[PDB]
């Protein structure tokens, strides 16, 4: 009854953590903490012991009220705790570094995307501007006839030359952003990818390290941890 394999609220949550698994005096006696559910001779149907009551229901709780009994060196199984705890904490930094890079790259990217919206908007306003000058510049060639003909139209065409070639530089500046956008977006897929491979092996490393620490405790621990 004392040992019983499966036999406060905080650590029991951390032992039920991650559907069917189970384990003050003045409020009541023992508590069955089934995960899917805290459940208080030992309600109405009372008929002898704590080991009695659990073996019956292992074979469902629907008919009671309207669904896994999970539970020799000492010094060298204690070094392993230091070993797996250095591995586990090594692994955390790697998962933490990459969650920053991911989020920075999420921003760096989305910053780029905006800047492309910006460029494109800029370009519209420059494309709208060479359009703007062709209206008035070509009204101001024919209206003149001969006066200043090339001493005007050269310097009108010079301006117009600079306009569209400045457009040329912007468009190339945008393209050069877009190329790097994909390179960033590639690296972004790579950050996620490796996060997803570290993650499963992070939890197992964590889980073994708990069970290694469980088995020992069946103050000294802190130097290893």
């Amino acid at each position: 009854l004392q040992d019983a394999e499966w036999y406060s609220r905080e650590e029991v949550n951390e032992k039920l953590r991650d559907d069917g698994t189970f384990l003050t005096k003045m409020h009541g006696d023992y508590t069955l903490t089934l995960r899917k559910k805290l459940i208080k001779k030992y309600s109405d149907p009372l008929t002898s012991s704590v080991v009695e009551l659990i073996n019956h229901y292992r074979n469902s709780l629907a008919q009671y009220n309207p669904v896994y009994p999970v539970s020799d060196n000492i010094e060298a199984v204690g070094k392993k705790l230091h070993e797996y705890n250095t591995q586990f904490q090594e692994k955390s930094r790697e998962y933490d570094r990459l969650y920053e890079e991911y989020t920075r790259t999420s921003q760096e990217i989305q910053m780029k995307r905006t800047a492309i919206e910006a460029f494109n908007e800029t370009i519209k306003i420059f494309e709208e501007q060479c359009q703007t000058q062709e209206r008035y510049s070509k009204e101001y060639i024919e209206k003149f006839k001969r006066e200043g003909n090339e001493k005007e139209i050269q310097r009108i065409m010079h301006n117009y030359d600079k306009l569209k070639s400045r457009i040329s530089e912007i468009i190339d500046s945008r393209r050069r952003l877009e190329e790097d956008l994909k390179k960033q977006a590639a690296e972004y897929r790579e950050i996620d990818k490796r996060m997803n491979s570290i993650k499963p092996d992070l939890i197992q490393l964590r889980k073994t390290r708990d069970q290694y620490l469980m088995w020992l405790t069946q103050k000294k621990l802190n130097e290893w941890l």
């Binding site: 609220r9 009541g28 459940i39 669904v67 705890n85 910006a118 306003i125 310097r155 491979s197």
Partner: protein, 1048 residues
Amino acid sequence: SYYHHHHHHDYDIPQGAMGSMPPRPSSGELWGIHLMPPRILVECLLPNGMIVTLECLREATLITIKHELFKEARKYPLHQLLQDESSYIFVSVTQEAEREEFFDETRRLCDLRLFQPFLKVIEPVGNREEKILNREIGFAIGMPVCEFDMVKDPEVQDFRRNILNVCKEAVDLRDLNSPHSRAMYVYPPNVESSPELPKHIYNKLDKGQIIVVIWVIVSPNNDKQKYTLKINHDCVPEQVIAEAIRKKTRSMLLSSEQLKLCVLEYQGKYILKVCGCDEYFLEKYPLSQYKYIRSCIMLGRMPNLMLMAKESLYSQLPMDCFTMPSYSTSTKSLWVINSALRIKILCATYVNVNIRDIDKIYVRTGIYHGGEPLCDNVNTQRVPCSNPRWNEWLNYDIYIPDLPRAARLCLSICSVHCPLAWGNINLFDYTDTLVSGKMALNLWPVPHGLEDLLNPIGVTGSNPNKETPCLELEFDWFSSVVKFPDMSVIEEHANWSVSREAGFSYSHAGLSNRLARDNELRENDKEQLKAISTRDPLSEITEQEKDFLWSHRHYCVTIPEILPKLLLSVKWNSRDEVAQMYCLVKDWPPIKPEQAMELLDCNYPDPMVRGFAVRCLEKYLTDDKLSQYLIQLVQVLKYEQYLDNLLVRFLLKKALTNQRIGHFFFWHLKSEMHNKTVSQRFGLLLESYCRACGMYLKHLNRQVEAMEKLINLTDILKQEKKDETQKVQMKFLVEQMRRPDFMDALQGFLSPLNPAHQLGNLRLEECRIMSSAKRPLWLNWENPDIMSELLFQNNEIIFKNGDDLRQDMLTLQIIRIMENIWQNQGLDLRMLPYGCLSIGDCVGLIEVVRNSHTIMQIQCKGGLKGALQFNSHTLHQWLKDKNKGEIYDAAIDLFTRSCAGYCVATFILGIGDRHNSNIMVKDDGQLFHIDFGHFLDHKKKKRERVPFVLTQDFLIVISKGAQECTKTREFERFQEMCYKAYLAIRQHANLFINLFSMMLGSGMPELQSFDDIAYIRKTLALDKTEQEALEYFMKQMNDAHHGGWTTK
């Protein structure tokens, strides 16, 4: 021999080294560059189609630039096709990718936030120039308003138009008894909650009297005159104003009767200012009840007020001038629908997984209410790891009429057991309409602390970020828009559901859900209920207790405070039960705000519950108490299902009713605008506030502009000026601060830490970069008050670019609350919760406490010459050096009073380990901690720790130099303060649990889920009885100290 000759081949030497400063990165005054060059070329696109490129100075105004553009455009062709310059406005593409017209031509070329350096010239289209000052709004919010106008979603649009209801109603309260009521909005009286005084404050009064000092001003306003009244603590501003006029105007030419009349024609022309800051005493409270006075009493200070004429005050107040913006029986009931729930998974697209590493991937799914209404299910592990596509109707064992109003699907893609992505949808929309059709949910990546599969406390909705796992799906369509019942209808169904139970017969085993005791219950029951009612939120309730509660629900009206436990004991999957709970809540006795706040956390998502919770706040929550808990109330908006809701309408109103609340309500929202979990919601909310808040928008825009100067400034110091000497950096800093754009922007404005204080004029000699690698700026301002000298001639606050303040900010708040608890229950421990304010992503502001030093400075200064050792008395000696006379005795009282409190607060919270450079002591002998770090013991994942371990240094000082301090009465006293304090918090432990619970919203790594908070149970020992808990604390304190702490 050292390393057993083991090589590490991989290891190569060619953000750990100088490992500080990790947030980043935000672009500045132009694209790709933090701070535009001091001279720069700008291409000016004209109306005539000509490009002229001006070389302008960085700092040049648009008035200056236009004036020169039109000079220099004569020299180009087609001059005659330009109108007089005055006929034009500027425009360019900005870094938010919008085309902003530039109306305020005083603005400088750097301050415009251009993308490419170019201006286009045009005539002002959209002749309401007046209306296109939501640049003002967009600037405050930091995203342009037009960005909402092109959002499709009706909820958003609907929020935008409907929330104006609130804005119009609040503005109607403002201009009610104006100008007084306007002054009351702007300068709302800064007043403690209660008029009743603690005994230790009272005893400083000699039978309830304080010497006060009323200053007054005389021609040509230069000469000022004191008038030191000694008046009652509980007399009001008007009584004080009279006495100060009595004294000012007694004379040898006025009889008493002549005086009395001169008092009456003067007494109501004036009001009381605080000398040194913009605080006022605008309404009838006991002087004591104003915060300024009470601090003056505690600090042993003489209040210094000013008589100010109301017309010089209603001079300064503007018109707030609110405007309405340009944006101004049927088909089905859910209970008819006779099927179970089934939802179709279709195809997740953008999933990034190593085929080498992972075997197989599937979609786990569930329905929830915070906790879940059916056995959780998955789907079969199909097209694994490589273009995954399932085409499965999932079948959830629950009838469609038994879905509660706030029911939510939570789902996630996983690995075999390991979550890749996640996302949760509301099964009903904001119009009550059951979700049917095809949805395109983009997912969220799992956080740090969350290892579990599904994450249901996570934000309801899709990610806006496109390039994420976009798991689309299909919902069952029932030939009609299926809607949730009316309340009138849920009422009727309950009235029937109760009357029906009254005829269910004799034996019902599974008594559980029904009384059988009838109008007469047992008295052993009635005391086991109030026994439950005492228990904190995290003492999880059993099925027996739940059912026990649920049956006796009608006697649970006797004990309103039980409600959270009762609400958690409803079967939210049984509409029969749920419909009855709605009918109790309908008229359940209102409860205290500190208890009603639990009901706005993640575990109470029902609209009716959250309704009742806001209803309590509307009644009991004072403007005082709201300010205290505003951080949690903003954070809890996240857990609301829809944008428009009662809590948003409550806060928005208070915010537009009280400008001191408004201020922090802006900044707390504005803080989190970086975070895509809330950018939409808070963006919209902030638009409302900003459109309705009167002239305070203009004041916010000045604060904002000043912060973004400092953000750019520190941002350069941390990129391009790393690897320079302080000397070089500091030269760069002062060079920059002297440019007129910085001079404009950083001089005339309000301290966001407290908008009562004004900042004017930088003293750049006292401005400096601290040593820290984060490159925090120590900034110093002149207090431009008429009575600066009476409070502080200089105001100085630290701005930190690298570091996340909101841990600190919460612990600081949590302290402030323990302090008030302790003091308002008559026991004096003086905590110094300094000012902290996060204003963005790892950007913030910290109040400087003048005259305080890290213990390490005490020891570095107390320089035992020659580097032999530091002496443990040096603190004691340094403190003696300051406090000499009977003063010394009182300073040790202060040290001993602070040291106790800080020991208990520290212990309970489990803040970072305390040490020389993070403990601080003040000249008058008060001690206080800084740089708290990880609050609820965040390194334990790698114990019930004691972070403040009182070394000799402290113990020496607690007793007055005595040897073997362990055994003085000086120490006995100190211990009993610790025990009395420890227990004080233990009677209020619900509140602290609750405050921490409300903060899970924020993406704080130290608050990921409730077991993080569970630490604060152990440390308070709430499972135990107080005398065991006492002994537990003594125990915990004794082992850390190695002697002392027994035989109470």
